[PDB]
Design a protein around this ligand. Structure first.
Ligand SMILES: [Mg+2]
Ligand SMILES: [Mg+2]
Ligand SMILES: [Mg+2]
Ligand SMILES: [Mg+2]
Ligand SMILES: [Mg+2]
Ligand SMILES: [Mg+2]
Ligand SMILES: [Mg+2]
Ligand SMILES: [Mg+2]
Ligand SMILES: [Zn+2]
Lengths: 178, 57, 116, 83
RNA sequence: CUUCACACAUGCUACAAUGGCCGGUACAAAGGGCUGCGAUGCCGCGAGGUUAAGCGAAUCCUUAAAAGCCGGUCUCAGUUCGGAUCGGGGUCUGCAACUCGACCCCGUGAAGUCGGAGUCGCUAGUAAUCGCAGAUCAGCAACGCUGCGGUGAAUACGUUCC
């Protein structure tokens, strides 16, 4: 039983009926998935992402990722169709709540010269997306046993209908805004 | 496919230098992830030319 | 061992290893190792977690390091340009600001030879 | 005069052109030849006409140029390029 | 007179381990000084500030010579090599340091890993390296010039060739 999930349905779940006037308890927003991908564009050359971009997201998120292939060829990017260019992991259920705790508690203040996250990064429906620096911040990968550094970007997908309905939800979970 | 391809993800205790500690589930072997900065001992979680001419004179 | 966000290189003496922080050179690293009692001739692999707390707070109360120092250097350059002083016009063109000679030298503010 | 023992340096004929216009609250343009005079926090809002060799360039002290000399804002040399 | 798409010339500092840094400790010569030289004492991390002894000088000040020696550390790295550029804060002289001074402290840490065709000096206290002093001078762009001493080499068969 992860601590962020039980803290959600103890006081976060009740507080959103006061900030927003819902008439039914099924309308209360809830984060449904957290999607993480590297997006390794330097894999159209050198063919080394199995050792470096799969062995680290397995350690960060818990489960092995999916290798994503290119949909169309681009001549300017030195790319084909069906070429491994992206590496995605999807987090559901109870491993989502443990990743959102472990991101906001011990990970996210290890960004070099960290000052916050911006609250204008909503897509219009209530789904936040930020990005990170490198194979730093997460302790589960070590800095000594790795290849070249590479960053990622993290989606957070809610059931909220609008923007600030998802801003009030992630402020309560523990995303630092400004 | 949720069998013997995923890495080891067992329960884990994390301590901090401040004294805050909690228990989650991570991939670190031994359950001994130790941080030096956390969500309570970090800043931002807890907080002209005219004035320099006067300071010279 | 991470100190302020700099990730000190292992097997290096603490007299010199702190100079890899952007903001600390040789004389300021002599007083980090004076107000915290850590001797100069100690390798950084033997750096104790009890020791590393003592010098992650003397710096944040008395020094100015990465991020909020590098944003003071580039902001003082930014002050000179839009007020239109002589050094601000001299920064916009890549020519030396401190009265240097521009006839046969200043190959540092400029690049290598263009050879017209 | 550059040392923190004898204060800043303004030419005395320039002080009695701005002290006689701070009291009666007017912002007339001051024609001057004193490039060497240090800007002080009584020039805020004024303008000047500093001589650079050939003409008088208008310079308007706003707030953020109060430590520099007055002749830094009037370039004495002209260079557009060799080609 | 100090500009700057460039080009040549004379130098200086480097590219390191026959070295860098830190601590200790020996050895000079020739010069300069009343609109001056500032011993000592205190203050300052330092440039220097202040007090003022002595002295027209084989008397007093300049005056700590540096390489060298002894010990410790660094262990071949664009570095504890290199110190360019730039940011901040200062001292001094001078009516005045913006164009356009030198010095100091802190931070910053560029090129450079011994240099193509070609080319330069030197036959002995010489070359190579290390300091110090003078003249002009309020200060100084002094790495220049005129001097001074310390440590101290390698070769010259020979006149075929330039
Ligand atoms: Mg001339
Ligand atoms: Mg050095
Ligand atoms: Mg003293
Ligand atoms: Mg020795
Ligand atoms: Mg290089
Ligand atoms: Mg080398
Ligand atoms: Mg001869
Ligand atoms: Mg002189
Ligand atoms: Zn803590």
């Amino acid at each position: 039983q992860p601590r962020l999930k039980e803290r959600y349905r103890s006081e976060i779940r009740d507080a959103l009926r006061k900030q927003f006037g819902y008439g039914n308890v099924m309308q209360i927003p809830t984060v449904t998935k957290v999607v993480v991908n590297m997006g390794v564009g330097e894999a159209a050359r050198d063919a080394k992402l199995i050792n470096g971009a799969v062995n680290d997201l397995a350690l960060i998120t818990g489960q092995k990722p999916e290798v994503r292939r290119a949909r169309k060829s681009i001549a300017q990017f030195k790319l084909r169709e069906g070429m491994p260019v992206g590496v995605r992991v999807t987090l559901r259920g109870d491993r989502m709540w443990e990743f959102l705790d472990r991101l906001t508690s011990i990970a996210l203040p290890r960004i070099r010269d960290f000052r916050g996250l911006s609250p204008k990064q909503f897509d219009g429906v209530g789904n936040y997306t930020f990005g990170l620096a490198e194979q730093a911040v997460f302790h589960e990968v070590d800095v000594d046993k790795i290849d070249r550094v590479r960053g990622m970007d993290i989606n957070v997908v809610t059931s909220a209908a609008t923007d600030d309905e998802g801003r009030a939800l992630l402020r309560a979970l523990g995303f630092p805004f400004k | 496919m949720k069998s013997d391809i995923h890495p080891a993800y067992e329960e884990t205790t994390v301590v901090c230098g401040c004294g805050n500690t909690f228990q989650t589930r991570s991939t670190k072997p031994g359950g001994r992830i130790v941080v030096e900065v956390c969500s309570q001992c970090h800043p931002f979680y807890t907080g002209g030319r005219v004035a320099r001419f006067e300071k010279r004179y | 061992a991470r100190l302020v966000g700099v990730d000190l290189p292992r097997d290096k003496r603490m007299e010199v290893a702190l100079t890899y922080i952007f903001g600390i050179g040789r004389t300021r690293s002599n007083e980090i190792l004076a107000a915290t009692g850590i001797d100069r001739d100690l390798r950084t692999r033997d750096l104790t977690e009890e020791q590393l707390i003592h010098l992650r707070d003397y710096i944040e109360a008395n020094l100015k390091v990465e991020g909020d120092l590098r944003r003071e250097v580039q902001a003082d350059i930014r002050r000179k340009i839009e007020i239109g002083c002589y050094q601000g016009l001299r920064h916009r063109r890549g020519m030396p600001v401190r009265g240097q000679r521009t006839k046969t030298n200043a190959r540092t503010r400029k690049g290598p030879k263009r050879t017209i | 005069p550059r040392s923190l023992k004898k204060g800043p340096f303004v030419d005395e004929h320039l002080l009695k052109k701005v002290d006689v216009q701070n009291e009666k609250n007017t912002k007339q343009v001051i024609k001057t030849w004193s490039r060497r005079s240090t800007i002080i926090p009584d020039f805020i809002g004024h303008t000047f006409a500093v001589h650079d060799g050939r003409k008088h360039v208008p310079v308007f002290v706003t707030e953020s140029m109060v430590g520099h000399k007055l002749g830094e804002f009037a370039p004495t040399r002209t260079f557009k390029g060799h080609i």
